Amino acid sequence: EAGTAFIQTQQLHAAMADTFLEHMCRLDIDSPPITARNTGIICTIGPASRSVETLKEMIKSGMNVARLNFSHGTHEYHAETIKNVRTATESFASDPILYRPVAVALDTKGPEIRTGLIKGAEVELKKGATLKITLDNAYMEKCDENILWLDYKNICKVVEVGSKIYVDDGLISLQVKQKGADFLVTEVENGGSLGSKKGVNLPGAAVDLPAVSEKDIQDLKFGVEQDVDMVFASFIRKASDVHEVRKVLGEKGKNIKIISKIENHEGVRRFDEILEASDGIMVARGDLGIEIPAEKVFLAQKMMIGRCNRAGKPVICATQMLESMIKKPRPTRAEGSDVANAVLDGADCIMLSGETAKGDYPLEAVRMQHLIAREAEAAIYHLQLFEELRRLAPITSDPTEATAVGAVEASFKCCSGAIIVLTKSGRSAHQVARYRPRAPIIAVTRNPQTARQAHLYRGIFPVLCKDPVQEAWAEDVDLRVNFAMNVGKARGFFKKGDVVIVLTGWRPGSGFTNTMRVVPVP
Amino acid sequence: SEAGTAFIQTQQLHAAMADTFLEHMCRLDIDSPPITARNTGIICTIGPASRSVETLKEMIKSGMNVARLNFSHGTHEYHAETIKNVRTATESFASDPILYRPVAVALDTKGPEIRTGLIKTAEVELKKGATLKITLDNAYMEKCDENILWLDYKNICKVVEVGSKIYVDDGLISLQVKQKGADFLVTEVENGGSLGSKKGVNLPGAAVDLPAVSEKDIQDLKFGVEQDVDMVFASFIRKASDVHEVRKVLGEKGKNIKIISKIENHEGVRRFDEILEASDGIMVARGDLGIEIPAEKVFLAQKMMIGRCNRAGKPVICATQMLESMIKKPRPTRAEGSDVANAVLDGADCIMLSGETAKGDYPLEAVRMQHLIAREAEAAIYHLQLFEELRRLAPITSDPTEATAVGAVEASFKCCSGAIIVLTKSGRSAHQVARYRPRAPIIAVTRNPQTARQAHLYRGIFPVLCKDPVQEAWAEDVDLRVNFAMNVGKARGFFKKGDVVIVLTGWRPGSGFTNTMRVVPVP
Amino acid sequence: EAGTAFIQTQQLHAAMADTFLEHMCRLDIDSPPITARNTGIICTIGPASRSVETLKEMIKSGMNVARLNFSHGTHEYHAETIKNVRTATESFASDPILYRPVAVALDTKGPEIRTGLIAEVELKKGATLKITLDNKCDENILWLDYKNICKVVEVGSKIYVDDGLISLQVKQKGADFLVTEVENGGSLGSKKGVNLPGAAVDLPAVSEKDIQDLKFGVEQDVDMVFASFIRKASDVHEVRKVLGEKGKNIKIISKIENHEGVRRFDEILEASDGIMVARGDLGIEIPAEKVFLAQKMMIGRCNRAGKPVICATQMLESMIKKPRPTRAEGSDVANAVLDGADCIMLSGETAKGDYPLEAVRMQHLIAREAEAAIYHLQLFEELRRLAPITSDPTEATAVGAVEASFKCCSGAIIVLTKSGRSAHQVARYRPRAPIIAVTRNPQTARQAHLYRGIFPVLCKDPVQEAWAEDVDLRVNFAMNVGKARGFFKKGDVVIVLTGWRPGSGFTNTMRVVPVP
Secondary structure, three states, X not given: OOOOOOOOOOOOOOOOOOOHHHHHHOOOOOOOOOOOOOOEEXXXXXXXXXXXXXXXXXXXXXXXXXXXXXXXXXXXXXXXXXXXHHHHHHOOOOOOOOOOOOEEEEEOOOOOOEEOOOOOOOEEOOOEEXXXXXXXXXXXXXXXXXXXEEOOOOHHHHOOOOXXXXXXXXXXXXXXXXXXXXXXXXXXXXXXXXXXXXXEEOOOOOOOOOOOOHHHHHHHHHHHHOOOOEEEEOOOOOHHHHHHHHHHHOOOXXXXXXXXXXXXXXXXXXXXXXXXXXXXXXXXHHHHHHHOOHHHHHXXXXXXXXXXXXXXXXXXXXXXXXXXXXXXXXXXXXXXXXXXXXXXXXXXXXXXOHHHHOOXXXXXXXXXXXXXXXXXXXXXXXXXXXXXXXXXXXXXXXXXXXXXXXXXXXXXXXXXXXXXXXXXXXXXXHHXXXXXXXXXXXXXXXXXXXXXXXXXXXXXXXXXXXXXXXXXXXXXXXXXXHHHHHHHHHOOOOOOOOEEEEEEOOOOOOOOOOEEEEEEOO | OOOOOOOOOOOOOOOOOOOOHHHHHHOOOOOOOOOOOOOXXXXXXXXXXXXXXXXXXXXXHXXXXXXXXXXXXOOXXXXXXXXXXXXXHHHOOOOOOOOOOOOEEEEEOOOOOOEEOOEOOOOXXXXXXXXXXXXXXXXXXXXXXOOEEEEOOOOHHHHOOOOOEEEEOOOOEEEEEEEEOOOEEEEEEOOOEEEOOOOEEEOOOOOOOOOOOOHHHHHHHHXXXXXXXXXXXXXXXXXXXXXXHHHHHHOOOOOOOEEEEEEOOHHHHHOHHHHHHHOOEEEEEHHHHHHHOOHHHHHHHHHHHHHHHHHHOOOEEEEOOOOHHHHOOOOOOHHHHHHHHHHHHHOOOEEEEOHHHHOOOOHHHHHHHHHHHHHHHHHOOOHHHHHHHHHHHOOOOOOHHHHHHHHHHHHHHHOOOOOEEEEOOOOHHHHHHHOOOOOXXXXXXXXXXXXXXXXXXXXXXEEEEOOXXXXXXXXXXXXXXXXXXXXXXXXXXXXXXXXXXXXXXXXXXXXXXXXXXXXXEOO | OOOOOOOOOOOOOOOOOXXXXXXXXXXXXXXXXXXXXXXXXXXXXXXXXOOHHHHHHHHHHOOOEEEXXXXXXXXXXXXXXXXXXXXXXXXXXXXXXXXXXXXXXXXXXXXXXXXOOOOOEEEOOOOOOEEEOOOOOOOOEEEEOOOOHHHHOOOOOEEEEOOOOEEEEEEEEOOOEEEEEEEEOEEEOOOOEEEOOOOOOOOOOOOHHHHHXXXXXXXXXXXXXXXXXXXXHHHHHHHHHHHOOOOOOOEEEEEEOOHHHHHOHHHHHHHOOEEEEEHHHHHHHOXXXXXXXXXXXXXXXXXXXXXXEEEEOOOOHHHHOOOOOOHHHHHHHXXXXXXXXXXXXXXXXXXXXXXXXXXXXXXXXXXXXXXXXXXXXXXXXXXXXXXXXXXXXXXHHHHXXXXXXXXXXXXXXXXXXXXXXXXXXXXXXXXXXXXXXXXOOHHHHHHHHHOOOEEEEEOOOOOOOOHHHHHHHHHHHXXXXXXXXXOOOOOOEEEEEXXXXXXXXXXOEEEEEEOX
């Protein structure tokens, strides 16, 4: 096999139900899944998971993307994580059929509001009471109940009367009564224990902090040097923030995908322009949950995933996934359901955080994610997804687009085992993925970066062809198609006598993946 | 460059197809030019008014796709020279392959007939209410008059009852049978009129037992094979065994000749399904049906038969009483414009003109007018619904050609393509596309001359005959054929630089299936 | 049973086909029709048909509306026709189950350009012909009574003569004479009709004579007016003005007879109560390759608006001399029905031909056969999707009635209506089941015939003191009419529309009711 996630046996000839309701009634928990796991698994690599050995096991169990969290660590430390990721990835390269591309993602620390120290270190903040938030440094090393300092100079500009301010990522709540001439005076809504350099969130305030801190500028230039596939850009509030990130990555980093993290109210409010400007979106439920009423976050998640699905842009669901698996070898029922529901809402990828970065069971976390994501696939109602996305786009006439919608249509009609797409940039495979076929998309490419970036898209299984370009265009095609047939047979996607859809250009160095073939598997 | 006037059919590809049939009707505009090409085939009967090489050339230029020969009259030698003139006219355009329009030759048999005897030519006046005795007794063959009538159908009596109608001379004279003898009938003249010598008889509702193929038809079918006709229109088909008989006589030499069954009576309508299964296509002969069946049911029979043909993906031709007024006038009635148009809208693949082109005074104007009406009727077809219904009825399979043909039609609607280009040897791939009824014209590129001619049986196929030799690189042989079809479509005004067309081909030489679809911008 | 059109037996639990194509595929010429005849029949009354005896037989054979052509005849002559129509109609009053309302239609003469008098001269094609106003008939000289042709004709105009049989081409005017050349040839008799292309005709839409005819119609209590030569909204407004206050309930049906009417159709429709498509007149200016489009477009727009549309002219012409129609005529009629026409009108066939009775019965036969080919599922689905999104209770109620009628395979939708409004709303959505509109207003009953699928019945019973008893009595009358006509039987289901509580007028109440 070469890993517990390698073989994902499909059955192609099930009756598709005429209604969503019937699709639900037919679910059967005693039935093994009969579909591939189509959602991407992103794991945060840190102290628990950064050894070459653990990483190999994680790749086997279904990790597609390694996330590096630049909130902590030096460049040296993260360069050594990346090197171990690439060693573990390349250890499977000897067998091109069993090689799984693994992407590297750099997640920036991003703009932050921090308190100043207690004196340096705890203080008890009293339900009711008053607290003055002060702003000049002559009060930074001394806090306690009376006063509190923080580094965001413009708080007073962006806060109004009755605004919430949260301290220590949600713990302490505050209610601003008056803006007191470059000061703030606050009623303690919640109250708890207060420490030093604790994070501050401003629900519904249009924070004025730069798109990119100087620390992020240096971390993004390191990402370019280190050849990363994508960046997760923090606290994105407007289209300009994205353009700034893109400016920093410049010409050398132009092929690096920018995933915008939506972590506050302004980001949700300005989502359309953020989406316009971005390559993808990450929904940070934890951070949204501080910034926005608890009970609206599920609305915000569903909206963002629907809009991304409509634009054909990758969306990653993040934070609070299998967080209990930091300390235990199984997740709760509720975690299972939350993960499942993100896949069912239409997420392309699910990201694991502390569960893989620093906890006691990184391996089991990956495996459990793969199990849940794969079981969720039974409850996806493919017909409706495809029918609605088809119905919700213009004429276009872009040959590659027209051919993508056709391949997906053909995949349903023929109950195909796969859609094989030959692609240099990945674009055709991405265009196929936005129409949400049931069949796996086998994206055959010679470009190693294309192959790694393809993991951002639901349903793309990237395979990296290492064979040189054959002279005769038609036999170069048959060779890449052959490689795909062999992977798909080996992963149990299909077998002899099944049918697959094949997408290609026509003749060498053509503009457009504009050629669709329906091909029996030999 | 226009050597036609049916040749240039300028299409406008970029308007939204309405979301309802009702809205499509509401948006019809008599003041704007048609934006579609003329997709139904035109079949013209060639006779004294049309058989010269010169008239035939202009008939091709005006839209004629198929030359019909009516073997009801004329000798083998008369019909052989007609066929020769059709081919001389057709081949006069071969010098420019872009202007060349394939033209098919169809042979329409006389078929089985019931005929009366002689009036000792002389006529006698039959009067309503009077009694007429019909006798089989041949001692009377030559002495028909106002009291006794001899017919040559020796089984009439087996097949008729008291109450039964008998029509004579194309429905002019009606008799109801009042007493049923063994060798004879006695009947009340219901209608009345002047009865001539050797006139045709119809038995409405009677399961007529004459042979599928007369002695004269066997001779005519063998001549068809020798003359390399493209199709036969077989008369008075009543049941599956009738079609098998025709197929047996055409035999192995005639195996590629298409058999179109003419439905001309009640039994044919009733046994339509078995006839359709056995036939290559169907011709609805409304005039004949009008005698054989209550006049006011014929429109139901037509709609029914055209529907079943569309469902089966088999050509259906509507014939008789099309632009008949144009035998003597240079313009048709409003009613005829409407009846032709409604046969197009019913789903007809082709329309056939008869005396209008065979013997009338304005053969050329009948062709021109048929083309005008058919092209305007196109605006009124709601293409989207036909396709969606045919897609949803089709038996579900994973067969690659069919998935590809359906996909190609789907893409043609979604990209508003200017054409579907299909490279086809036998024509099958192009026929598979046509049966899904795209709005866009199908340009079927073939090197097979016969394939090119027979393609006209299907609505929407514009066949072009590629003359170039087979290139050594398959990919180059494809682009050569595709380029040719591009040149043709540009010249006919189907599309232009910037537009998109759908292209269907195989994948490598021979292989098996036309399983490749490309969405190609027009260079 | 009194008459050949009375019993229209139905079978209800069909299963409608999933596609239009399957619907066509399942047509079967040997099966008797299993639906009522839903299309209205309008007959022109004239010398052959104006006797009480003939009118009675015509009613029994399916005539729903009697058209009076005021192109000819005096007020005295028409008053007597109307009196005969009403005598014949009221002869059936004595059994209310058997009583069929019959409407009277007044068709205006309108403006008419007409030639003079000399035998037939053959205008051989190409050969001169000058027109004169000087109050003589060969290839040079022809006179006509439109004093302003010269003012309205500019070198290159066309002049049609005798119902488009001839077409002359002016290309030199002389402000009193015109010098034409024959463009289309034919034989030319005496005292003919003439037309000009586009909007050239400036003659008033309502003439002094039309004003007198329309006021006559008001005093004779006619149900509808067929307004000739309507070319724009303001022609409709002038007719409505003349009919005025007293004639406010008279339906105005604008006749579309020329290219200009087609061009300005949207405003004519808006301003009219309905439309008549005069195919023959259309075919004078408009070529044969376009007339069928105009017909389909106009019937389509009428259907979308919910306004009655009548197909007229060249229907069963051959039946003027023959007792049977041709195949082509049968098809032409059937195709008007399938196009969505609410009524079909007979002209010379009933007015002056030898077989008035047979032309009616044969119209009925064809219209009833055409019903099998109508795909009611799609009509309703589409008209539902294209209706403006209102909350109007009467509209929601009508749509719900039709939907319940399909779901329940109901034998009928029974509508209790003083004004007919609710029955008209239901007919717009094209149910398969017949609409039995129960009314005590005789005008409502008569005007109902303009709408496809309405069977109007006139309740003669007095109002019951208890409202629910008054409702049950009218519904019971409807059940009886429907059983006698064979629409349904005991054990079937019907849809019933009413108001809630006495003397409303607002029909917002739907019930699903077993046939007892």
